[PDB]
Amino acid sequence: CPLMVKVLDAVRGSPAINVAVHVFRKAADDTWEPFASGKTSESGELHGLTTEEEFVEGIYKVEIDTKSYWKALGISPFHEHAEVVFTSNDSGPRRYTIAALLSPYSYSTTAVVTN
Template structure:
C-alpha cells in the first residue's frame, strides 16, 4: 500500500450553503472527497466566530454525516453578522482511509 500519494490525491472540497430545508439552522456545510468524488463522512468540523478582541470563539464542534453534510452546526440565533472560521480535521479523515495526511486541518 503506497502511503506517499501525490498532493492531488489528498484533496477535500468544502461547500457552504444556505440551508433551504431548516430555517432554524441557516448554515449547511458539505465536505466532499474530490479525489473519490464522494461525500466525506465523519470529518470533525469546528465553527468559530471572531470575538471583539480578535480571538476566535468556538461556537460548535460536530462531525459530518454519512453524506458528508453538517446541517446543524449553528442556529439562526447564533449566526449573526460577523467573521467566521471553519476548521476541518482532515487528518482524521485521511487516517480513517489508511492514508498519511498531507496536512492536519484545513481552515476556511
C-alpha cells in the first residue's frame, strides 16, 4: 500500500464514510488521466488504491468528492471537492498517507510520508 487516503468529518467528529476518491496522474501532454479510485470505508480509510509497480514517479491529483458527502448529510457545502496535487518521489522506502479533514466551508489536507 504505497498510497492510502484517510478522510475525517470535523462537524460530527467521525470518519467520513463512503466518500468517493479519484486519483489521476499527469500525462505527458499535461492532461489528467485516471489512475485509481475507491470509496472510504467505515474507518474513513481507502486502502488498496494502487501497487508499488503502478505508482511510478509523477504528478498525482487526489480528488475527494466532498460535496456529495455533505449533501447526503443535509449540510450545505461550499466546495465541489477537495483536490490534493503533489509530485511523488522515490527517495528510499516510502508510503504516502493523504489525510483530509472536512468541514462544510473548509478543508485541510496533510501528507504523511513514512518509511
